[PDB]
From a paper:
The ER membrane protein complex ([name]) has emerged as a conserved player in the process of membrane protein biogenesis. The [name] is an eight (yeast) or nine (mammalian) component, 248–284 kDa complex with considerable mass in the ER lumen, membrane, and cytosol. The [name] is comprised of cytoplasmic, transmembrane, and lumenal domains arranged similarly for yeast and human, despite significant evolutionary separation. The [name] presents two distinct and structurally conserved cavities on opposite sides of the transmembrane core that differ in size, shape, subunit compositions and apparent function.
We obtained reconstructions of yEMC bound to an antigen binding fragment (Fab) and hEMC reconstituted both in detergent micelles and lipid nanodiscs, with the latter strategy yielding the most isotropic and highest resolution data. Comparing detergent and nanodisc maps for both species identified two major gate conformations. One of the conformations, referred to as the closed-gate conformation, results in a more occluded membrane cavity. The yEMC detergent map, yEMC nanodisc map, and hEMC detergent map all show the unassigned helices in the closed conformation, preventing client residence in the gated cavity. The lumenal positioning is consistent for all three of our closed-gate conformation reconstructions (hEMC detergent, yEMC nanodisc, yEMC detergent). Yeast EMC2 features a more curved helical arrangement with N- and C-terminal domains in closer proximity to each other than seen in hEMC2. Although yEMC lacks EMC8/9, yEMC4 follows a similar binding trajectory along cytoplasmic yEMC2 and yEMC3 surfaces. The lumenal cap differs between hEMC and yEMC, with a four-bladed distal beta-propeller in yeast and eight-bladed distal propeller the human complex. Upon identifying antibodies against yEMC, we observed that the top two antibodies bind to a similar extended loop in the distal yEMC1 beta-propeller, perhaps suggesting that this site is accessible for co-factor binding in the ER.
Author numbering:
A (entry chain B): 3 to 292
B (entry chain A): 255 to 269, 274 to 284, 287 to 304
C (entry chain C): 2 to 35, 41 to 83, 122 to 198, 220 to 253
D (entry chain E): 2 to 40, 45 to 134
E (entry chain F): 12 to 106
F (entry chain D): 8 to 25, 141 to 190
Write the structure that this text describes.
């Protein structure tokens, strides 16, 4: 049944398994192998090994990891241990197999051997991201991780959206709400048709408005409408854009905002129609609560 | 038509010899001469 | 005329050879395929960032248009055709010469009798009766659907600084201002 | 074997049979003309067009309506658009994305490496470990 | 406005059209069709197959799956499909 | 996405700062090929191309003329 292949490849290219709960992650791990060994037709070799390394990461997340060593042994055969995926995989393997930090130094000089472009730039970009992930745990927690990213970011690799997105997340978590607008604007700049960076760039403006003055509140809510209308224009059943437009227009409640309220209520009742699954429960509550 | 064609195929199915039957290269020249009109009787 | 069972040994090998040499051509073009300092790729990357902020990111940055430009300016300042067709013409003219292979279903003009019937030295045979080379002259044009079906697939700083100075007020795009009209222009 | 491959095999057999029968009939219209010193259309035609129509319906019944599985949930809940092709307007494309609980931007949104290290350090503590 | 999903359905259309220009022509060569009747036969049946494709697979809405559908289903890849028909017709006429 | 909905619907106040020319030109590019290369010998309106569609005139029509 190739629909399982569709689900697995969507999880793959979205990397949604990172955001999985342990129960659904266990379900993913259990239902992976049956198709992995049963439905072996029409599946290319590259997808075969991509599924293998997804299973490697799922096992490493999971409690038991002897199968992680087994899977790494099976996948070592092609392209050895010089590919960036393999380097990251074995670094994680040595980090978790004994809870020893040593891998970082055997990675560190490796980054200092990649300056001569022996591999692609995405390779040691990914290695830099992983070593920052290592070092934020080596010194358990600090704001300096953002500084590390910035010094790794600004000179070396502006283009990468992921770094700016993590900077914006850290700024939004407890930091300033203003620099996050700049970071999200850049993420919008690199990826033109991102329809979830407009929802975040409207939510951050809404959060910045709730502690502002009345004229600044009006300006920020106007900008939130002008940024949420693009999440409306780039997707129809996008839940968060419609909910945010409805919420801010309800907060204002003007006549043409009342027109937008009627339209957004109709669209949120369309979303909460039972075609969509488990997004009805977060739309209907916001609809019928107030 | 289906029965006669399928029975003709079945009878010749056996007698590798299959590849040489597919080859159609391997011969008696009398049928070749009779097909082209080469064979004739000259009445003198 | 009455041709005699030379359709097989001419039509089938020629088509097989064209299909196989097309596959080999695809594989060889795949295998053949037809900066080292970090600073070099870094500058190329910044150049590309300038290009995309000209074209890609210079559309929906309505508030942020003014802030970017200071940072930008401060940081900145046919063998494939020729080989196989000739080889196939050579092979066809070697192995298959002085034959009549078939008659086409459509009547050509007499210069095609000159071109196509090179094997035969007659003078009034027809235009519709062709030698073996004609089967190649069609098989070149018409083999695209078969290939599809079997499965086959296909100094620096000054200039961009000048365009950076050019793009300051060239176009501030009317986006994030008119979007309410366009949302209310649809979804009715 | 569902209808498409069945119709391919049946079309191939019918077309080969009709081709051989036409080969036989058109060979003994010149040989028989020569035997006289230079002196089965309807059923064959109808069989040939039957084979052609079978092939066309075999090429058209190879399209199945798109049906999915949700990324989040674990029951079947086939999310069917009732379409044969994929929409070109970005609104409906991202719509069919959003009905599934995934986000095509993916890595940029989740930032997989950092939350990966944090959660795999977290996963040791929780109860399922 | 539009996404990069047009390539997939365009490829599906191209496969359908390619597979419907090498059974036409072959059928014509089996029936020993002559010069001009063959071309008229091909035009009629090819446009009929395009119309039934618009009806059946496309759900009577050529827009929302292609842009400028009258240009893309009918006129595009037309001189890349008369020639495959000629090849198959020549192959069929010689047997 | 229930979490962000919950955190956005309620109130929180916490922070820590610390055109015809193209047609005519393409017609010229379509007509150069006809004039220059297909018109060498490969086009009808020559008298040597309608020869295979001409009649015989049926000379005798009433006579036999046997001989030795
Ligand atoms: C390269 C693809 C092959 C195309 C060949 C043309 C095939 C169509 C065709 O047979 O028309 C022929 C080609 O007679 C000629 O040879 C004159 C050519 C006229 C078209 C010239 C285009 C500029 C001319 O029409 P017709 O009525 O005067 O001939 C008698 C009727 N017929 C026996 C043909 C049924």
């Amino acid at each position: 049944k190739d629909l399982v292949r569709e689900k697995l490849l969507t999880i793959m290219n979205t990397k949604a398994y990172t955001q999985f709960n342990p129960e659904q992650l266990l379900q993913l791990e259990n239902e992976m192998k049956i198709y992995m060994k049963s439905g072996d037709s029409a599946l290319t070799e590259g997808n075969y090994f991509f599924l293998m390394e997804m299973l490697f990461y799922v096992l490493v997340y999971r409690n038991q990891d002897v199968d992680a060593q087994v899977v790494y042994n099976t996948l070592r055969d092609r392209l050895g241990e010089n590919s960036y995926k393999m380097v990251i995989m074995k670094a994680t393997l040595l980090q978790i197999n004994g809870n020893d930090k040593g891998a970082i130094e055997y990675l560190e000089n490796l980054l200092n051997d990649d300056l001569e472009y022996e591999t692609d730039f995405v390779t040691y970009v990914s290695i830099a991201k992983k070593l920052i992930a290592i070092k934020t745990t080596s010194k358990n927690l600090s704001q300096e991780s953002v500084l590390k990213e910035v010094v790794a970011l600004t000179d070396k690799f502006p283009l990468d959206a992921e770094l700016w997105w993590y900077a914006s997340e850290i700024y939004f978590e407890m930091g300033q709400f203003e620099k996050a607008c700049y970071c999200l604007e850049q993420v919008l700049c690199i990826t033109p048709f991102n329809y979830a960076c407009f929802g975040r760039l409207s939510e951050t403006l809404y959060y910045e408005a709730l502690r502002s003055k009345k004229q600044t509140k009006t300006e920020l809510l106007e900008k939130a409408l002008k940024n949420a209308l693009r999440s409306v224009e780039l997707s129809e059943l996008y839940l968060k854009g419609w909910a945010l437009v409805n919420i801010i227009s309800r907060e204002l409640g003007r006549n043409k905002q009342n027109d937008l309220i009627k339209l957004s209520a109709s669209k949120l009742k369309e979303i909460s129609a039972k075609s969509n699954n488990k997004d009805k429960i977060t739309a209907e509550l916001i609809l019928n609560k107030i | 038509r289906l029965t006669t064609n399928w029975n003709r195929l079945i009878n010749l199915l056996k007698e590798p010899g299959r590849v040489f039957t597919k080859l159609l290269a391997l011969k008696d020249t009398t049928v070749s001469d009779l097909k082209f009109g080469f064979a004739k009787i000259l009445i003198v | 005329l009455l041709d005699d069972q030379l359709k097989y040994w001419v039509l089938l090998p020629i088509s097989i050879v064209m299909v196989l040499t097309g596959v080999l051509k695809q594989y060889i073009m795949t295998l053949i395929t037809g900066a080292q300092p970090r600073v070099k790729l870094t500058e190329w990357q910044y150049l590309q960032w300038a290009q995309l902020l000209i074209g890609n990111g210079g559309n929906l940055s309505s508030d942020a248009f003014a802030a970017k430009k200071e940072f930008l300016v401060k940081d900145l300042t046919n063998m494939a055709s020729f080989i196989p067709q000739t080889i196939i013409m050579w092979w066809v003219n070697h192995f298959f010469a002085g034959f009549i292979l078939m008659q086409l279903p459509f009547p050509l003009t007499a210069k095609f009798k000159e071109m196509l019937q090179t094997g035969i030295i007659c003078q009034d045979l027809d235009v519709r009766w062709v030698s073996s080379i004609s089967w190649y002259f069609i098989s070149v044009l018409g083999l695209n659907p078969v290939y599809n079906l079997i499965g086959l697939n296909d100094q620096v700083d000054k200039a961009m600084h000048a365009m950076a100075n050019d793009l300051t007020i060239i176009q501030h795009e009317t986006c994030l201002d008119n979007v309410e009209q366009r949302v209310l222009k649809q979804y009715m | 074997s569902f209808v498409s491959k069945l119709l391919y095999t049946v079309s191939a057999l019918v077309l080969f049979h009709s081709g051989f029968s036409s080969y036989e009939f058109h060979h003994l219209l010149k040989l028989n003309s020569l035997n006289n010193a230079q002196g089965l259309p309807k059923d064959i035609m109808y069989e040939t067009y039957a084979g052609l129509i079978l092939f066309v319906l075999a090429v058209f019944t190879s399209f199945e309506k798109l049906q999915y599985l949700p990324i989040e949930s674990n029951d079947g809940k086939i999310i069917s658009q009732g379409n044969y092709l994929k929409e070109i307007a970005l609104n409906k494309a991202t719509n069919v994305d959003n009905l599934i609980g995934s986000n095509p931007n993916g890595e940029i949104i989740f930032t997989p490496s950092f939350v990966d290290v944090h959660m795999k350090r977290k996963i040791c503590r929780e109860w399922a470990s | 406005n539009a996404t990069a999903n047009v390539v997939d359905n365009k490829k599906r259309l191209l496969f359908v059209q390619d597979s419907s220009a090498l059974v036409l022509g072959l059928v014509a060569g089996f029936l020993q069709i002559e010069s001009v009747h063959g071309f008229i036969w091909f035009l009629i049946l090819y446009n009929l197959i395009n119309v039934i494709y618009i009806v059946w697979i496309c759900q009577l809405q050529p827009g929302k799956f292609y842009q400028s559908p009258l240009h893309d289903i009918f006129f595009e890849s037309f001189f890349r499909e008369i020639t495959g028909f000629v090849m198959a017709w020549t192959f069929g006429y010689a047997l | 996405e229930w979490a962000k909905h919950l955190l956005d619907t309620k109130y929180i106040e916490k922070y820590n700062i610390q055109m015809f020319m193209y047609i005519v030109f393409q017609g010229v590019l379509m007509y150069i090929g006809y004039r220059k290369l297909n018109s060498m010998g490969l086009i009808p309106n020559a008298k040597g191309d309608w020869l295979p569609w001409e009649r015989i005139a049926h000379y005798n029509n009433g006579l036999q003329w046997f001989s030795d």
